[PDB]
């Protein structure tokens, strides 16, 4: 392990963060060590921030211009200057805490210059502030109230709902209430949003919303708008798939089957149309090694940064240097960026560690590794998941120390490919024995078996229905897991194909119900 003094000499990165976090959790960072340490942290968010703050709390920040404004309370705010009054009224909790006579006074003070504040003040003088703000069609107020409390729910008329998409909060609002199946009056109201007023993710979610109310014509119009506006081909394909499922225009399915993006939708469309499986690149570097240490996490952070900030020209230089067997995962990574995501790279590095598993298991392992890490041995996530299979420390230590009783086990062994694949196999066995489907296994790998079980216990998820299992896949209640499953499923299909163990993706879909 590295001392704090040694780490401080490394460039700031997630790897340096991880090793600082390891010192913090072992109580090895003194109050003195901690003094300059925020400047040594690359991403000062989450557990590293809360551990550091147990040693040195942060006070900040109050803009010194307004410090005096924060010496008033709800009982003394009428003594504050007008600037201080309006700063403190940025907080809806602060407004809620005022007495109603003071809300009336302040509403009058601000009626001319700040009718937004007046609207919220008089709204909080009623038993339903959301109803008041909706009657005013105060869009900024609406979103401030929703952020304050998700519990408000009311029917919204055609005029009001068509104004909501112009506000930056709309996309997360729509996503959250549709996926969480919350705020039903708001959800029903959003059926009247004109597709002309939405785009991209928002249009797509509004298509999903319309399907849940069996408004299939409105759903088609939203999905069509999403397909026309999405920046990424994979998302466009997801929208075209819905266009096809709803109205069965064979030009939509034809366009989907010819996509440059390899995803479950394009793979499915290819299968339905007797279109050949997409071309998978074959990478076989003749040069066997270079000088790069594939086991140094710091070296990976540094080369990743360079690769991501390389121009079109510098990528060709890095491609050549890393065109070796030993650095195959870095090579494929460089090519994927360098060919602008047009070529399909599905490598199988360190294959000797999995070649004795059955091919279906090989493909599942490889499918997970590809999405988790792109096979980078020293991969570290923002939550400090580790190595090719991206194990969290807690589970790594549980398996390595308690279950397998590996002598001298340390969580950093997860950076060794033999260990990653072996532990991945071990955990995938647990999950698959309980869940069966590779899609459900992927949900549970990323999101946990508890979340997956709770989702599958629901009456409205992965049951029979007109648009199942595709609808359920859109309603997986955690965005990261919803995305992850779709990607890992595609990878799985590809690797099964590459291992001469093909399965029709239609069989996978049938088995979800
Ligand atoms: C190294 C790292 O941050 N890996 C994360 C992965 O990132 C995706 C990819 C392509 C490997 C990138 C962007 O590095 O996304 C997964 C969720 O889909 C996470 O479970 C992984 O922890």
XYZ file of C-alpha atoms and ligand atoms in Angstrom:
535
model
C 0.000 0.000 0.000
C 0.954 3.673 -0.440
C 1.376 6.295 2.280
C -0.539 9.569 2.026
C 2.809 11.266 1.161
C 3.296 8.926 -1.834
C -0.289 9.308 -3.062
C -0.054 13.095 -2.885
C 2.701 12.879 -5.572
C 0.313 11.095 -7.993
C -1.901 13.071 -10.369
C -5.486 13.543 -9.133
C -7.705 10.700 -10.424
C -10.268 8.128 -9.334
C -7.373 5.745 -8.560
C -5.767 8.243 -6.192
C -9.201 8.909 -4.687
C -9.744 5.158 -4.145
C -6.376 4.826 -2.320
C -7.103 7.899 -0.155
C -10.482 6.396 0.662
C -8.757 3.147 1.709
C -6.583 5.112 4.172
C -9.652 6.895 5.537
C -11.617 3.688 6.102
C -8.609 2.168 7.969
C -8.333 5.363 10.126
C -4.854 6.085 8.814
C -5.464 9.774 7.890
C -4.766 12.099 10.841
C -6.463 15.484 11.323
C -3.118 16.951 10.237
C -2.872 14.803 7.080
C -6.444 15.841 6.311
C -5.747 19.633 6.241
C -4.816 20.090 2.557
C -6.544 16.980 1.305
C -9.617 18.292 -0.684
C -7.119 19.675 -3.305
C -5.806 16.090 -3.662
C -9.231 14.620 -4.407
C -10.382 14.273 -8.046
C -14.074 13.693 -7.337
C -15.111 15.083 -3.965
C -18.479 13.382 -3.812
C -20.050 10.580 -1.776
C -18.246 8.394 0.748
C -14.779 10.011 0.376
C -16.419 13.396 1.168
C -18.391 12.084 4.125
C -15.315 10.266 5.591
C -13.107 13.301 5.174
C -15.790 15.467 6.841
C -15.812 13.234 9.943
C -12.192 14.392 10.394
C -12.585 18.072 9.277
C -16.228 19.351 8.911
C -16.771 21.900 6.143
C -18.591 25.054 7.189
C -18.946 26.780 3.771
C -20.274 28.380 1.716
C -22.140 31.615 2.219
C -21.428 34.321 -0.323
C -20.053 37.147 1.965
C -22.302 39.641 0.118
C -25.370 37.927 1.684
C -23.952 36.680 5.008
C -26.017 39.148 6.983
C -29.176 37.865 5.265
C -28.660 34.508 7.047
C -28.703 36.157 10.516
C -32.492 36.613 10.186
C -35.061 33.912 10.876
C -38.780 33.592 10.030
C -39.483 35.690 13.169
C -37.250 38.620 12.142
C -37.346 38.681 8.329
C -39.583 41.800 8.216
C -36.570 43.657 9.750
C -34.332 42.568 6.860
C -33.494 44.891 3.958
C -35.310 44.108 0.710
C -32.339 42.313 -0.858
C -32.109 39.965 2.179
C -35.895 39.421 2.111
C -35.794 38.233 -1.474
C -32.660 36.025 -1.035
C -34.287 34.130 1.910
C -37.505 33.675 -0.167
C -35.537 31.498 -2.614
C -36.264 28.683 -0.073
C -39.777 27.169 -0.107
C -39.138 25.619 3.312
C -38.397 29.190 4.506
C -41.684 30.378 2.954
C -43.566 27.433 4.559
C -42.119 28.431 7.981
C -43.443 32.017 7.803
C -46.678 32.977 9.437
C -49.500 33.792 7.074
C -49.756 37.543 7.931
C -46.058 37.928 7.070
C -46.626 35.975 3.808
C -49.399 38.518 2.934
C -47.095 41.474 3.758
C -44.182 40.119 1.728
C -46.475 39.215 -1.248
C -47.531 42.861 -1.424
C -43.883 44.039 -1.113
C -42.885 41.841 -4.064
C -46.006 42.000 -6.276
C -44.409 44.399 -8.815
C -40.710 43.397 -8.976
C -41.015 39.667 -8.088
C -44.527 38.245 -8.875
C -42.876 34.790 -8.726
C -42.320 35.336 -4.972
C -45.828 36.785 -4.530
C -47.311 33.698 -6.192
C -45.452 31.278 -3.849
C -46.189 33.389 -0.734
C -49.921 33.524 -1.386
C -49.847 29.861 -2.461
C -48.518 28.841 0.986
C -51.397 30.806 2.594
C -53.739 28.110 1.118
C -54.223 24.491 2.048
C -52.913 23.449 -1.425
C -50.054 25.642 -2.774
C -49.827 23.457 -5.920
C -53.436 24.224 -6.851
C -52.815 27.942 -6.466
C -49.618 27.834 -8.619
C -51.370 25.676 -11.263
C -54.277 28.180 -11.476
C -51.655 30.935 -12.052
C -49.833 28.761 -14.678
C -46.609 29.836 -12.971
C -44.204 27.338 -14.536
C -41.082 28.194 -12.461
C -43.305 28.024 -9.325
C -44.622 24.610 -10.400
C -41.142 23.111 -10.611
C -39.998 24.774 -7.328
C -43.031 23.209 -5.607
C -42.381 19.798 -7.150
C -38.746 19.936 -6.013
C -39.986 20.933 -2.504
C -42.463 18.075 -2.396
C -43.287 15.193 -4.743
C -46.524 14.565 -2.866
C -48.492 17.331 -4.621
C -50.598 15.878 -7.438
C -53.318 17.589 -9.473
C -54.890 17.430 -12.928
C -53.224 19.857 -15.347
C -55.113 21.258 -18.351
C -53.867 21.166 -21.996
C -52.481 24.716 -21.910
C -50.462 24.211 -18.705
C -49.020 20.761 -19.560
C -47.803 22.097 -22.951
C -45.873 24.844 -21.138
C -43.957 22.441 -18.860
C -41.522 20.972 -21.489
C -39.736 24.354 -21.983
C -38.371 24.254 -18.385
C -35.046 22.438 -17.707
C -36.692 20.406 -14.883
C -39.239 18.786 -17.203
C -37.112 15.830 -18.397
C -36.326 14.525 -14.869
C -39.891 15.296 -13.730
C -41.423 13.206 -16.549
C -38.883 10.431 -16.184
C -39.335 10.164 -12.427
C -43.122 10.181 -12.266
C -43.500 7.773 -15.256
C -40.866 5.221 -14.103
C -41.846 5.434 -10.387
C -45.575 5.299 -11.278
C -46.100 8.299 -9.043
C -48.291 11.377 -9.293
C -51.119 9.800 -11.366
C -52.989 13.037 -12.077
C -49.786 14.568 -13.456
C -49.155 11.330 -15.446
C -52.641 11.296 -16.969
C -52.359 15.017 -17.758
C -49.146 14.460 -19.770
C -51.194 12.502 -22.362
C -52.220 15.939 -23.740
C -48.675 17.160 -24.412
C -48.303 17.909 -28.134
C -45.367 15.863 -29.544
C -44.309 19.073 -31.305
C -43.363 20.500 -27.865
C -41.064 17.622 -26.715
C -38.036 15.765 -28.044
C -35.397 13.165 -27.271
C -35.700 11.374 -23.904
C -38.748 13.398 -22.878
C -40.713 12.433 -26.017
C -39.654 8.806 -25.496
C -40.876 8.743 -21.854
C -44.160 10.352 -22.941
C -44.571 7.491 -25.450
C -44.046 4.997 -22.590
C -46.592 6.971 -20.522
C -49.149 6.803 -23.338
C -48.713 3.007 -23.682
C -49.533 2.563 -19.952
C -52.937 4.299 -20.594
C -53.397 2.250 -23.825
C -53.259 5.431 -25.933
C -51.336 3.682 -28.729
C -51.835 6.382 -31.435
C -50.504 9.100 -29.058
C -47.677 6.723 -28.063
C -46.697 6.233 -31.701
C -46.576 10.027 -32.269
C -44.293 10.538 -29.246
C -41.970 7.673 -30.232
C -41.793 9.014 -33.803
C -40.760 12.434 -32.480
C -38.140 10.822 -30.256
C -36.737 8.821 -33.194
C -36.480 12.028 -35.253
C -34.640 13.973 -32.527
C -32.480 11.516 -30.568
C -28.750 12.236 -30.951
C -27.648 8.590 -30.444
C -28.438 5.874 -33.020
C -29.016 3.301 -30.222
C -31.755 5.506 -28.678
C -33.226 6.232 -32.105
C -33.422 2.453 -32.702
C -35.260 1.978 -29.366
C -37.850 4.561 -30.518
C -38.195 3.055 -34.022
C -38.742 -0.337 -32.374
C -41.760 1.102 -30.534
C -43.047 2.744 -33.736
C -42.883 -0.745 -35.301
C -44.473 -2.664 -32.377
C -47.402 -0.244 -32.282
C -48.251 0.238 -35.964
C -46.261 -2.523 -37.769
C -45.076 -0.371 -40.677
C -42.567 -2.642 -42.397
C -40.412 0.343 -43.463
C -39.779 1.069 -39.715
C -38.625 -2.500 -39.107
C -36.502 -2.371 -42.257
C -34.783 0.816 -41.109
C -34.190 -0.710 -37.666
C -32.711 -3.919 -39.208
C -30.193 -1.805 -41.186
C -28.963 0.266 -38.201
C -25.197 0.877 -37.772
C -25.815 0.473 -34.015
C -25.687 -2.988 -32.513
C -28.295 -3.140 -29.752
C -31.132 -5.504 -28.828
C -33.619 -3.672 -31.130
C -31.442 -3.792 -34.255
C -30.459 -7.415 -33.442
C -34.133 -8.343 -33.012
C -35.143 -6.582 -36.261
C -32.370 -8.426 -38.132
C -33.620 -11.717 -36.802
C -37.288 -10.965 -37.741
C -36.251 -10.088 -41.321
C -33.730 -12.905 -42.027
C -30.950 -10.264 -42.152
C -27.361 -11.563 -41.553
C -25.814 -11.102 -38.102
C -23.783 -7.828 -37.914
C -20.086 -7.967 -38.644
C -17.860 -8.258 -35.576
C -14.260 -7.010 -35.873
C -11.416 -9.430 -35.326
C -8.420 -8.060 -33.386
C -5.334 -10.263 -33.320
C -2.159 -8.209 -32.644
C 1.017 -10.030 -33.736
C 3.275 -7.969 -31.400
C 3.046 -9.726 -28.017
C 4.007 -7.167 -25.351
C 5.013 -3.580 -24.689
C 6.355 -1.718 -21.651
C 2.910 -0.794 -20.257
C 1.980 -2.150 -16.823
C -1.620 -3.471 -17.096
C -1.600 -3.951 -13.314
C -0.832 -0.297 -12.398
C -4.101 1.601 -11.704
C -2.321 4.992 -11.887
C -0.900 4.217 -15.340
C -4.428 3.381 -16.590
C -5.914 6.696 -15.291
C -3.146 8.628 -17.099
C -3.462 6.766 -20.434
C -7.310 6.954 -20.294
C -7.111 10.725 -19.956
C -4.734 10.968 -22.937
C -6.861 8.676 -25.063
C -10.007 10.759 -24.284
C -8.271 14.090 -25.118
C -6.473 12.749 -28.214
C -7.449 14.426 -31.485
C -8.301 12.219 -34.542
C -4.520 12.145 -35.286
C -3.150 11.291 -31.792
C -5.521 8.272 -31.508
C -3.673 6.701 -34.521
C -0.392 7.056 -32.652
C -1.733 5.416 -29.463
C -3.467 2.650 -31.501
C -0.068 1.571 -32.851
C 1.790 1.663 -29.518
C -0.963 -0.456 -27.765
C -1.441 -2.894 -30.724
C -0.110 -5.810 -28.675
C -1.552 -8.963 -27.160
C -0.748 -7.847 -23.580
C -2.518 -4.458 -24.067
C -5.392 -5.789 -26.244
C -8.087 -4.151 -23.962
C -6.391 -0.737 -24.399
C -6.091 -1.312 -28.187
C -9.805 -2.154 -28.604
C -10.626 0.881 -26.432
C -8.567 3.180 -28.667
C -10.092 1.714 -31.873
C -13.665 2.066 -30.563
C -13.082 5.835 -30.082
C -10.869 6.193 -33.201
C -13.506 4.631 -35.558
C -16.196 6.876 -34.062
C -18.195 3.950 -32.577
C -18.963 2.496 -36.084
C -17.106 -0.798 -35.752
C -18.212 -3.567 -33.340
C -15.443 -4.732 -30.973
C -16.159 -7.802 -28.847
C -12.791 -8.999 -27.518
C -12.215 -12.004 -25.276
C -9.032 -11.242 -23.288
C -7.467 -13.538 -20.644
C -9.605 -16.271 -22.254
C -7.644 -19.134 -20.675
C -9.382 -18.291 -17.373
C -12.865 -18.981 -18.783
C -12.347 -21.513 -21.585
C -13.405 -24.473 -19.393
C -16.786 -22.943 -18.507
C -19.672 -23.844 -20.794
C -20.038 -21.399 -23.665
C -23.307 -19.860 -22.442
C -21.537 -18.990 -19.152
C -18.483 -17.665 -21.028
C -20.778 -15.359 -22.980
C -22.562 -14.048 -19.862
C -19.218 -13.383 -18.135
C -17.846 -11.635 -21.234
C -21.105 -9.670 -21.717
C -20.909 -8.320 -18.161
C -17.153 -7.521 -18.366
C -17.544 -5.657 -21.665
C -20.139 -3.257 -20.183
C -18.554 -3.036 -16.695
C -14.988 -2.204 -17.699
C -14.324 -2.719 -21.408
C -11.945 -5.360 -19.969
C -9.573 -2.796 -18.366
C -7.987 -4.816 -15.492
C -7.500 -1.792 -13.161
C -10.875 -0.170 -13.869
C -12.241 1.899 -10.994
C -15.759 3.329 -10.919
C -16.940 6.532 -9.224
C -18.174 4.228 -6.396
C -14.781 2.395 -6.340
C -16.045 -0.804 -7.949
C -12.886 -2.664 -9.034
C -11.348 -4.455 -12.042
C -12.863 -6.079 -15.167
C -16.004 -7.355 -13.385
C -16.409 -4.196 -11.291
C -16.874 -5.756 -7.868
C -17.751 -3.519 -4.938
C -15.151 -3.926 -2.104
C -17.697 -5.372 0.337
C -18.693 -8.266 -1.935
C -15.073 -8.763 -3.109
C -13.960 -9.230 0.531
C -16.954 -11.415 1.405
C -16.151 -13.814 -1.469
C -12.315 -13.645 -1.183
C -11.942 -13.881 2.644
C -15.086 -15.515 4.030
C -16.181 -17.792 1.163
C -12.985 -18.717 -0.712
C -10.612 -18.129 2.186
C -7.895 -16.984 -0.236
C -4.632 -16.584 1.776
C -3.522 -12.919 2.120
C -6.600 -11.790 0.137
C -6.860 -8.086 -0.551
C -9.715 -6.395 -2.503
C -7.075 -5.174 -5.027
C -6.834 -8.804 -6.210
C -10.015 -7.892 -8.174
C -7.620 -6.131 -10.590
C -6.148 -9.542 -11.527
C -8.103 -10.990 -14.525
C -7.962 -14.571 -13.116
C -9.574 -13.316 -9.946
C -12.166 -11.077 -11.654
C -13.396 -13.914 -13.947
C -13.392 -16.471 -11.122
C -15.334 -14.230 -8.760
C -17.643 -13.148 -11.582
C -18.385 -16.808 -12.347
C -18.984 -17.423 -8.635
C -21.445 -14.544 -8.253
C -23.170 -15.183 -11.630
C -23.815 -18.765 -10.440
C -25.565 -17.452 -7.338
C -27.681 -15.026 -9.406
C -28.559 -17.332 -12.309
C -29.654 -20.188 -10.069
C -32.259 -17.798 -8.606
C -33.204 -15.698 -11.686
C -32.455 -17.863 -14.816
C -32.816 -15.213 -17.545
C -29.512 -13.466 -18.517
C -31.462 -10.177 -18.524
C -32.656 -10.643 -14.914
C -29.136 -11.723 -13.926
C -27.798 -8.484 -15.445
C -30.364 -6.353 -13.559
C -29.351 -8.105 -10.288
C -25.608 -7.865 -11.030
C -25.833 -4.064 -11.340
C -28.789 -3.284 -9.086
C -28.797 -6.159 -6.530
C -30.957 -9.288 -6.204
C -33.217 -7.470 -3.685
C -34.290 -4.760 -6.151
C -34.637 -7.373 -8.919
C -36.795 -9.671 -6.722
C -39.011 -6.740 -5.714
C -39.452 -5.706 -9.338
C -40.303 -9.303 -10.404
C -42.782 -9.639 -7.462
C -44.930 -6.830 -8.943
C -48.191 -7.612 -10.788
C -47.352 -5.151 -13.557
C -43.743 -6.194 -14.415
C -42.604 -9.017 -16.741
C -46.102 -10.578 -16.883
C -48.056 -11.366 -20.055
C -49.401 -8.427 -22.094
C -49.753 -6.939 -25.569
C -46.380 -5.125 -25.486
C -44.483 -7.414 -23.062
C -41.692 -7.949 -22.227
C -40.572 -4.761 -24.017
C -42.833 -2.429 -21.967
C -41.474 -3.864 -18.655
C -37.920 -3.238 -19.873
C -38.815 0.484 -20.213
C -40.245 0.613 -16.658
C -37.294 -0.908 -14.708
C -37.343 1.628 -11.875
C -33.559 2.481 -11.710
C -32.176 4.179 -14.815
C -28.642 2.760 -14.567
C -30.002 -0.824 -14.263
C -32.616 -0.258 -17.043
C -29.857 0.813 -19.453
C -27.373 -1.821 -18.207
C -29.712 -4.766 -18.867
C -30.372 -3.739 -22.501
C -26.624 -3.347 -23.154
C -25.554 -6.531 -21.411
C -28.294 -8.505 -23.217
C -26.986 -7.309 -26.606
C -23.448 -8.255 -25.594
C -24.596 -11.691 -24.442
C -26.258 -12.380 -27.821
C -23.102 -11.293 -29.664
C -20.711 -13.412 -27.539
C -23.012 -16.478 -27.795
C -22.806 -16.001 -31.558
C -19.016 -15.587 -31.533
C -18.589 -18.773 -29.437
C -20.642 -20.878 -31.890
C -23.390 -21.099 -29.353
C -26.007 -18.878 -31.058
C -29.391 -18.236 -29.516
C -32.287 -16.359 -31.066
C -33.004 -13.156 -29.144
C -36.716 -13.970 -29.617
C -36.209 -17.041 -27.344
C -34.743 -14.715 -24.682
C -37.752 -12.397 -24.974
C -40.240 -15.290 -24.772
C -38.561 -16.548 -21.573
C -38.953 -13.148 -19.843
C -42.706 -13.352 -19.533
C -15.040 1.862 -14.917
C -16.465 2.212 -14.695
O -16.784 3.319 -14.277
N -17.370 1.270 -15.012
C -18.807 1.410 -14.982
C -19.495 1.307 -16.366
O -18.995 2.275 -17.228
C -19.252 1.976 -18.615
C -17.967 1.858 -19.427
C -18.348 1.693 -20.913
C -16.966 0.750 -19.028
C -17.197 3.126 -19.170
C -17.903 4.410 -19.443
O -16.079 3.058 -18.642
O -20.903 1.468 -16.243
C -21.502 0.427 -15.461
C -22.961 0.707 -15.489
O -23.501 0.536 -16.807
C -20.922 0.437 -14.035
O -21.480 -0.655 -13.306
C -19.393 0.341 -14.062
O -18.822 0.421 -12.745
